[PDB]
Symmetry: D3
Subunit: 189 residues, 6 copies
């Protein structure tokens, strides 16, 4: 069951779904448009020879921030991490889905990739995997709309929400473009 605009506003003003800062004009028929932050992470290490999801690789990424008023330039075939301006707090009976915007998709900007679910009980900023598949570089302007977020009802409240210790959650209360933490609790055969 998917929340409409009427029921989204109702969740926000009742304080059960948190969006901060919230702006009413961003509410769309079925979802809410979200905006790009001003910090990015680039993959510009020259020491590592490979990425091993089983190891923590500290210096794999660098923090970059466009000079104010200037854009960040995403080169063709480059991959960077970005963040949402807004902070999201979901209750334990709602699930989120993050999708890109059609306007940007049509330019060749892939805006997350492969990763849907925002878990019930999640609280923090959202990390965005930004990718360019066009043959020109794209200029990203901090504060621009970058994606959109819709809410699904769950059948019943989550027994062990995100951030609870039974779930073993890696990203509760995350801030910037946060690097991968897969080495934590890594399993294999």
């Amino acid at each position: 069951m998917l929340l409409s605009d009427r029921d989204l506003r109702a969740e926000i003003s009742s304080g059960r779904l948190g969006i901060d800062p919230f702006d009413d004009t961003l509410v769309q028929p079925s979802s809410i448009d979200v905006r790009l932050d001003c910090l990015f992470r680039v993959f510009n290490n020259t020491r590592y020879t490979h990425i091993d999801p089983a190891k923590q690789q500290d210096e794999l990424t660098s923090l970059v921030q466009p000079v104010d008023g200037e854009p960040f330039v995403l080169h063709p075939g480059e991959f960077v991490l970005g963040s949402t301006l807004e902070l999201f707090t979901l209750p334990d009976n709602l699930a989120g889905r993050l999708e890109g915007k059609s306007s940007l998709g049509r330019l060749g900007l892939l805006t997350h990739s492969t990763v849907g679910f925002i878990d019930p009980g999640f609280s923090g900023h959202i990390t965005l995997e930004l990718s360019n598949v066009a043959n020109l570089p794209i200029t990203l302007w901090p504060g621009m709309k970058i994606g959109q977020l819709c809410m699904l009802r769950l059948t019943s409240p989550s027994e062990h929400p995100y951030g609870s210790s039974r779930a073993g959650s890696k990203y509760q209360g995350q801030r910037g473009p946060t690097p991968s933490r897969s080495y934590q609790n890594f399993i294999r055969s």
Copy 2:
């Protein structure tokens, strides 16, 4: 809540969900298979130096149509825009999700790219961002199944559906592979 085949047909023959032209044999257990049109847009401009979502960039794409009976050839690492053969009209209490087909995915043909939602009240053809990630070119045949569409029930009807002036919608009643219109109402810092 996701509509099954039974309830999809029921929506179509009651005239609340529009598909044109409709073909019953395309209805799947949980979704409906959709077909590729015969118009494409290619990014073959040589004047622009970069893509700026904040500006309208008119001559960024060219319209192309395969000679009849011939295929469109998608080169490895190319990106093109395509369209659906069908025209979709959604009511204000249903939302749509577009996904690729597993048979094509396994060949290295991406269909949706970063984007998912179809808004309640939307009406028109659907633009497809087609990409090739294999190491060989892929021949696309106009009229082929290219993807699939499922419908989600909303919690309550959309207050300000797609195309309504409160939503500020850019694509209502779109026809061919439509270029990006992100410059319209563009916000930033």
Copy 3:
């Protein structure tokens, strides 16, 4: 309507949703984490000049298996097919959605791509389209968590589920990383 952890377990232990082998610690607040198998398919043919979805192209892929304890190395811009360790059986009133994991996405590993739908009544392993978009190769370890699966309620049971002959389904009971079968019943 999306099943929570409580209702997922309830489906599994009532035998209506099959996961094999099942492991309870893989159940997440809204979904269940799934693990990578040890067979892959690589696109290393040098005879074909193009891919035609309308023709069956037999030798388009090769089967590869890492030497035991070793990883499979996914090169930047490479595309391979993988499989899930688990075998999934869905009832005819549930649908599934497969998504990647945020920890791996942040590394540049795209796990499926462009396909989300598991059909009511589907039974088999899941084939995964694995892709690397970083500028370094990634080591994939067999048995690692690779993705996650949630379940949606349908409005009513599927009239003609997956694998039923009215649906014309190509992949019922699939085993390894299965090649594309689009040539079957191809329309244009």
Copy 4:
């Protein structure tokens, strides 16, 4: 034996080595700098599925010309054909070698491919295979210096020079960015 600036000028003003239009300020210590024309060929066909050197493939390329004053934009990983402003006529006792310029190499501009020889007796413009390996598009301005050309003495005059019918030459007197003609006299 490689001609120096002194001996190059001597060949040009004696009329044995033709450069047209010639400009004396383009002569360098060991070579002569050459300039980019204003016509290009782009590979933007969507009908062909592969390149077969053994077949003539007519519509493989399109002719493009920047609007006057504007640059041609070479995208990262694109490949285009260009031409020299100048027309070169070599005698039958000199051979030419074409190389890029270090100022452009350092920007990521590959300017000819993997080819260097200008055969004795060749006459015509030179086709340039232009390539970008940087991560940003490069703007090429018509009339810019794009490469350089030096001359080697042969041990003795060429018995059957370029363009002679015993050599079987495909490109004698070529004009614009000329598409490949490998299908002519193709052996296998």
Copy 5:
């Protein structure tokens, strides 16, 4: 000083410059056209995580041979190793330079890897680094002309020619597409 056709034939028929098999119709005004063999090496290992020129990496390449009458298909952005049909034996007073052919360069086929020089005294087949920069795959036909070879006079014969033990040569008498042997005698800081 560069040998012309006249002086090339004279070297060949005097037995000082060896080409086997020799074909007179391949002699060009300033060079001699050379043909592609029928064995290739592809880089299709999945165990190594990086290339270290300092280590021998045995299974880095696989030997492949087109089925007879069929072509080898070089994919866009692929890199393979090939060989010359001919076996070259240079004297100790001549140097060779290998270059591609203009007809193939214009199709997007790079025939070697930045490499040029063939050393006085060298004897064997030549390994070719084959590369595709077009957006379509190229079909290479065994026995096709693939490049060309000219000869430069040296100021005086080579004191310690190629293959002599003072030179420390890695490839004397090579046969097929031979993998890199840089690990032999590798120096660093």
Copy 6:
């Protein structure tokens, strides 16, 4: 006319061809092997939208130096600038040609872009355009042999050698991996 080993050593020990530091065991039958320095330039700017050879673009590159004993990792499809350990001084009657090494070419390591000419009179280090075309990253070790240099005799001494003001030379006495200076004296 191309100098052999015998005549190269003769030029070096007579002081007319400068190599510093020189090492005799690097002299090869027809050329002299050269070694990689320990500074690189990477193209990691995020402000510029395109490369314009006609404008100086200051912050286009960054200086990077591997931690001592560690390698520099060149990623597939990356492009960096490097330098030669040695400093070359050529006389005004010799020309140089730079080429890669076959052992590295076979690994997928491109070592100069399209260029090759070293001008008579040139003095300084040589800037190397390093490129990776394999599907795995390559580790470059500072001090490794990276390329080779041969010498051609000119017909007669250069009238206006490199670095002379008539030639208008941009790179005389260059030190590290020097960025492009094409904007200087740019014509169009």
